[PDB]
Amino acid sequence: QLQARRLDGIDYNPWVEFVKLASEHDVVNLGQGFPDFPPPDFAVEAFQHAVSGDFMLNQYTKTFGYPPLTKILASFFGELLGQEIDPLRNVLVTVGGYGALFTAFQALVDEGDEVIIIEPFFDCYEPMTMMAGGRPVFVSLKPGPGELGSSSNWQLDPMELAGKFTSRTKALVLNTPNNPLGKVFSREELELVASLCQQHDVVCITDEVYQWMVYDGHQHISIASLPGMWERTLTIGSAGKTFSATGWKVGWVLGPDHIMKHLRTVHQNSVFHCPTQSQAAVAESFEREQLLFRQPSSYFVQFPQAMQRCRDHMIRSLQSVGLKPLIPQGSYFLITDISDFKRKMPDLPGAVDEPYDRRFVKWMIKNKGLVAIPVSIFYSVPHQKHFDHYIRFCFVKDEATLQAMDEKLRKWKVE
Amino acid sequence: QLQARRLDGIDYNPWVEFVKLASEHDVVNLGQGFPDFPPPDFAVEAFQHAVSGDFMLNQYTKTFGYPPLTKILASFFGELLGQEIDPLRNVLVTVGGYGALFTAFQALVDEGDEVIIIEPFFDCYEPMTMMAGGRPVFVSLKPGPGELGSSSNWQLDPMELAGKFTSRTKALVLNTPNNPLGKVFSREELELVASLCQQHDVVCITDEVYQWMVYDGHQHISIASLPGMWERTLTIGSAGKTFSATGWKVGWVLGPDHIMKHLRTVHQNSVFHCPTQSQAAVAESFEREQLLFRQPSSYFVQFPQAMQRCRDHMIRSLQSVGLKPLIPQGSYFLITDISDFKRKMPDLPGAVDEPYDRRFVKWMIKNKGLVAIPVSIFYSVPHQKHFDHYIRFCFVKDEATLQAMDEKLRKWKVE
Ligand SMILES: *Cc1c(COP(=O)(O)O)cnc(C)c1O
Ligand SMILES: *Cc1c(COP(=O)(O)O)cnc(C)c1O
């Protein structure tokens, strides 16, 4: 009654409980979705230059983006997408990927509109839909029928997906590479999404923050580059996941003018400007990567290779204590199946209707000194019963962190 | 139909037209509401330190604020307000004062709620109310019955104000010091607002970004410090207007837990984090000012004194060409009455229902090389007819800018 109705049912953050429990124990924290090592030297230096350069960078820049930033976005991403991008009509700088998602939902989603969300989903898609008055409609990726799983083998059933589309469908939210699963959507999968979006006249909100974090030769493909998709796609990126600097909180949306103008309305009536100097830092960092594009000294070549090693290390280490890793093709994350643990140890203490994975994670934090994230937080409440046996780890960590993880795991292995 | 209905009627920005016209002429730009000189050395250095310190400052900080920042906010503003402020329950860091306003509206304003707005109003209060489904209700400050006006003499009629309150009133938006008028609300004025807010059970959203920019001995008083007001007030500040660094885009809201928790819900479902390093810079800048509080070497003492001189200079200069300055007691701004110009020059070219001041500003930009802002943009459409003879100047400018202004004015004076 004091508060607006749009806040109904979205006030709870399943995060807090675990972050609080982790802080009161000796732990290796693999639940945190950010690097615990520095960004690359060129990125840090770029920010250093922004706060010691033209003194006027301390003052407001342009509402829809620091023009050198929108310039390099339009040019670099224009090439990557095979699309002509105008900085002013087609690019909007936002407060991170979060802010870009929020701006898209607030622009397009209205009372009674349906939004298709693919499980497992980055958790904010559901409450952002709700706050905008929309109705979330869920479709599940399903693992196909060795011992190690693979994210590529989690399938989007064409018949199940087509059936979610109605006359009320406003948007489908596509996240690739996917958090938490680490799935990189194939060309054929995107074409399935694309053809339904075109058939039913639906906007595809595509969350591509992990674009550069792809492994084992897999290619990131943007759905907006597909025939006829540019006119119905919003593409989201994040400087923080791009340059390993999550605290910068700079993101962007790319899209056609007839859609983007509504995002600009939301922007101008919410934050109006993004900070100047961080934008300058991001622009300079992209100019560096555009200069060295495809070269062995580029961050976009070097970094994924280093993190693939971290991923492999973690897969072997966790595999070794009964956890069943699902090999991701992209992102910061892998999930492990804990089904074997649910069999041997079903009666873990917890609340009623509290999914096993949440109870397991609490158990692991207290007894084993390892933090992961229960995967059921990335599922609609109705589906959490069935998808209650996965936990998410982050492998984008310093060598010393993974060494500390190994120590915890060796101790665990002893009984 | 593609876009959400909440966007109805809020897409137009009266700004663009003038910023575009100014850019295609030789001008002294006094329409810009930010300093064209550097922030103080300690502020710039604080940011420099943040991007060269602990490398982990490049990664996410806490959702509701960088803890050293919320700490100094709670402590310093706690003292200023005579209030005990808990960092976690009572402080929220936002993307500037803009973001803080937006967060407050989205948390509290719902379909059918009325919001009282005091004219002239910072222009975003109206569309933010509309986007949240609320109904703006307007009350006008009115100049009382020498040649130079005074912002202190613009009155809030107690009877007119009381009559705006209904059972649908959710919030009143109080901006002091006021942009564009430069009025600093007296204790008695705040008590009038306070007593009605308490009588009708209304939240006071108080925009106090210009808190430190007060002149001629006038005191900034926060309505939240008044008996019984803390429990129904949200107090907003902006690091950019505080430290002359508008591009930092760090702001905050202070308030009681039972209200703030709804703002936290909005925050967590919109941006989730604010950037880390700018927050660190702001924290260090406030620690500096708290250390030197009331001392002659403090920015909060030095800066207003310097800007008061700039204000006086501008008042004399503009007074000299027929413009009738209204002496502000606070803020970056003064307005001048252009009535004499409307008398001698009524038939200026423009669109139908285009207020005189908008036409005048266009004329002045093209012919006289000076930019100001038409004050009618800070009025509800119905009231723009009557309040069509004021323009807003910004005096927070480099000495050289004011010299250039004088040159333009001397040229003008010749016929
Ligand atoms: C981290 C993350 C974001 C948010 O990006 P920021 O730039 O940090 O706001 C958006 N989507 C996914 C899937 C993420 O993992
Ligand atoms: C400039 C201004 C703001 C915005 O503050 P930012 O911190 O720049 O977002 C809010 N209210 C008023 C009255 C202003 O003049």
UniProtKB/Swiss-Prot annotation, chains A, B:
Alphabetical UniProt keywords: Aminotransferase, Cytoplasm, Lyase, Pyridoxal phosphate, Transferase
User: Which Pfam families does the record match to this protein?
Assistant: Aminotran_1_2 (PF00155)
UniProt keyword Hydrolase, yes or no: no
Domain of life of the organism in this record? Eukaryota
* Organism field: Homo sapiens
Give the protein's function: Catalyzes the irreversible transamination of the L-tryptophan metabolite L-kynurenine to form kynurenic acid (KA), an intermediate in the tryptophan catabolic pathway which is also a broad spectrum antagonist of the three ionotropic excitatory amino acid receptors among others. Also metabolizes the cysteine conjugates of certain halogenated alkenes and alkanes to form reactive metabolites. Catalyzes the beta-elimination of S-conjugates and Se-conjugates of L-(seleno)cysteine, resulting in the cleavage of the C-S or C-Se bond.
- Which protein family is it in? Belongs to the class-I pyridoxal-phosphate-dependent aminotransferase family.
Regulation of its function: Inhibited by tryptophan, indole-3-pyruvic acid, 3-indolepropionic acid, DL-indole-3-lactic acid, indole-3-acetic acid (IAC), amino-oxyacetate (AOAA), aminooxy-phenylpropionic acid (AOPP) and Tris.
UniProt subunit comment:
Homodimer.
Give the catalysed reaction(s), semicolon-separated.
Answer: L-kynurenine + 2-oxoglutarate = kynurenate + L-glutamate + H2O; 3-phenylpyruvate + L-glutamine = 2-oxoglutaramate + L-phenylalanine; an S-substituted L-cysteine + H2O = a thiol + pyruvate + NH4(+)
The protein's name is Kynurenine--oxoglutarate transaminase 1
Q: What is the lineage of its organism?
A: Eukaryota, Metazoa, Chordata, Craniata, Vertebrata
